[PDB]
Amino acid sequence: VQLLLDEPKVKVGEIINLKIITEPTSTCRRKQNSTVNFLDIVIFDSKTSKILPRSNRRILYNGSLTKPISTTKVSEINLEIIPIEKGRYEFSVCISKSNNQDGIIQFDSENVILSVI
């Protein structure tokens, strides 16, 4: 996974497409069953302690963040991080394979940070 972003230095009242790019692997050959695989996008404060789904007065977005990918090819995804009253955020993902709890199988470490003035 890489994370392609527009700017790291946006002001408050502005709308940003975020673009993750995922690369499914040769070693997906163990399963093939759920071709669909559910990710998440989690937002960290760049101190600790991630914001909730109800990111009230911090970050805004379009739709539920679960936003599936294929185990086929280089799928893309998006959100619209409509920022509000912040500084120094962080974005990272995880992979969950399903919807249930204990479906989560890996946690990537790609942590693109952006600042808000």
Binding site: V12, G13, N56, R57, L60, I82, I84, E85
Partner: peptide, 9 residues
């Protein structure tokens, strides 16, 4: 709603 100074969401 949330409501900041001369902007609104």
């Amino acid at each position: 709603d949330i409501f900041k100074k001369d902007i609104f969401f």
